[model samples]
Target: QYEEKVRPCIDLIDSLRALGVEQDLALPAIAVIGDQSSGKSSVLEALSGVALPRRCPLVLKLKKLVNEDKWRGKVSYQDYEIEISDASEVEKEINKAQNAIAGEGISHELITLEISSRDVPDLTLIDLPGITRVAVGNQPADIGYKIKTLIKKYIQRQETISLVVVPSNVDIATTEALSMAQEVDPEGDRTIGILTKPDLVDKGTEDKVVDVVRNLVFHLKKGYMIVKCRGQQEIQDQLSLSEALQREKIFFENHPYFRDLLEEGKATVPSLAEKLTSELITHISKSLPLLENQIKETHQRITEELQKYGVKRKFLKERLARLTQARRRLAQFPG
Candidate 1:
């Protein structure tokens, strides 16, 4: 959907993160990462979703306001906030914000978007920069290492789960993105594996797809899923376009073996909708006590920080009064 060279942080949410409450579904956060051939941003496209100006903290702080009219959006960083009129404006503003903040150089600054929509559950996502071995064009040579470190910061959080999508046609036995997840989420305790591009599966290798999706190959504790979204010059347009669910559903069901995957509620786009929201609810509810305390702790830092200005002003006023009183006394005495 980002055909105009306009890249946005993460897809839409509403306007309610001001309170810093981490209860609802959006609190715990979910991270998505994919390489270029892994169908970049493609998992979210299937997850009932949608990154980045990666190499920075691109936090998708999403909120779902009940009974809200239309979609409302805002992009804020440092002390700046921009009102987002619609979806298209989001890309331009986020790109502009990054340019303003980083100024043609990568940064450690966090740019947040408080977005709410009638279409989604409150959730968080980080669409990391596509994996690259060598820097291209104006890209930095160390950009690879820089991006990896940025990704580690987000996924390393105990409150977040990392979704690593690797293409089905390739070897899942070794993938940089998936390996990174394992590094942070050792034992695969909090990592979910995703396989995409079944449409691109090499000839005579379809069974391997089943094994991976069946959780039999290159196992992940949270298991795996496969999806097919249109990504191509001419191939995708011919078989998959306009409607996403049907083509994916049909693709999963069409294969004799893959049909079992569809039967188990393991394949296609809709299951992720079910799985993701459940996991978040499950996560937020399970971590309810923890999230509340953390949010309160976060609030206290700013809550008291906001009180500092008046305290400083009061201190200045009393000191100035005392010094002036001393000055008047000095004039009567000597110099």
Candidate 2:
């Protein structure tokens, strides 16, 4: 009986510990979903200390070890698994996996990225491809539909603790990702709203997002967490996690608007990271048995779903069969 109160999900993973099984399913107690260019990628990259491709459904399992442990990363999908030696190499290995698993486009398939490092947090956050393909998106016309189905499939589950990422610069209530999360979790009980790109907010509207983060505008049982990554190009500038964080710290500290949140520890990722981890641990404490069974069922069902990638395969094959030939003709020419 005392098991439920302390060190939750330790035993949960132990019981589910038969690793390298068909756990292709995404049972992320915490999931990150957002609309395209919502800076979800920035927030995620800030947390993991690595680069993230802006596509695919990925289970990012980050495990922090003692200060003595070296960095290690392993990616698994469709019976193929490879180990990564350095933090910087995760991006390349993952893209190769995506190309291997679903070719070069959107896939409902899940890639499991397990990272073990002394610097990372002991948590699992799932990433879904951005939703609502807008005018700037170069994807095929119907990809928006596919992205919707993919996000809905994962976030709708009762066991999924949804982390909906929204841009502080945009109207939060209008974002597709948050609206969908709220649709499934009507009471807002299981949803966590994350405000990204805090630096990009309109000058006067900075106070507006502060209200959202305050839980006054859009209340979630587990309110919003704010993070700022300047110009949204911080990572693309070949930045490191250490610098990015110090930058966010300074940015928050110097902020005329969000400094109070910084003091309260709300306008940052570390606080989100710690609070979200505790939320999952506490949630698992209550639902250990059910969560365990769901993992089992998720494995069985998701494994079958894993084996059946032919829907996307056929679509890509058919779409590419036509375009591949056309592109072949174009490839004969120059850019």
Candidate 3:
């Protein structure tokens, strides 16, 4: 539902990289999102093969602190354990303790939670704050905005592959999810859906539920699958190829996000003037007198050589004007 709102940022990913960002920093990222009690923490634990604390920011920060001082630069997943407790009590304590942590300037990194895993491939499980505002003690508006920002931040961390865990019981096609999907992937690709807790529904009624989910997700998401434990691989094929939903009966497959971008926008052209103004400004800034005078002087020498070789003064002046315009454009690239 919220995917469309993120479309502009996703669309600008490549442009950001071209402006000096890294590809790995702009690639599609995986995330876990759904309402509270959707088994997000459980999914994260299963993916990591370790049970981490079922809270955010706090546990994540603690892990970082202990690692920095004692682990001597080990991966975050060296070893981990899941400490379970009553959700309400846990949240209450976390809230109380967060003030202390925040006062010490540790809130930013210390507030996140993750389990130690043993090399789960292509998995970047993001345990989102519970969807209910009361859980995090924030208004719905603030919580929603925080969720959006968190998704953006975490995805930038793992730009290659990303997943979003959605509760099967949830509408799956909520305006929030759709807006988020498009926001993170405006091209409507790479934002696949994980229908968590499929076992909650019986096989007998799975088809009907899948249809409802399919209809809502078709407009906003990239792909969808009824997620089950990896141990349940035998029935995986059945779920993917089943036609009981009367939807497409195909095996598990997906089209790449980049490929979709190319297919949809190949031969796209700009209507603006030939020069990219920002790029020109940035180049000019880097070539200012204090930086690289030799290169700037070389341009004049080259022009003089061309003039001696029978180029007209008017033509040379035009070329100089183009160079000056190019120089002006270099200063606008972001630092």
- Candidate number of the best TM-score: 2
Residues 276-300, candidate 3: write the lDDT tens digits. 1122223233334332243245457
Computed on alpha carbons, the lDDT of every model, listed in order, comes to: 0.61, 0.72, 0.37
Write the number of the candidate with greater TM-score, choosing between 1 and 3: 1
True lDDT of residue 165, candidate 2: 87
Task: Give the lDDT of residue 58 in candidate 1.
Answer: 61
Across 1-335, the per-residue lDDT of candidate 1 in tens digits comes to 12111111112111223322222223355677766568755555434232222245566655554653466778888889888877545657778877777866247676776565644445566556666667788878988888777677667777678878889888886788888887887777777877777777887898988888887866677788766776664334444333666667777878766788788887876676557656655554554445335434544554465466664656545444433433343233211
Task: Write down the lDDT that model 1 would get.
Answer: 0.61
Runs with alpha carbons beyond 4 Å of true place in candidate 3: 1-28, 55-107, 110-119, 122-126, 133-141, 153-162, 202-205, 212-222, 228-335
* TM-score, per-candidate, Cα-based: 0.69, 0.79, 0.40
Residue 273 deviation, candidate 2, in Å? 1.0
Which is superior by TM-score, 1 or 2? 2
Whole-model alpha-carbon lDDT for candidate 3: 0.37
Error of 2 at 178 (Å): 0.7
RMSD in angstroms between candidate 1 and the native structure over all alpha carbons: 12.6
Candidate 1 vs candidate 3, lDDT winner = 1
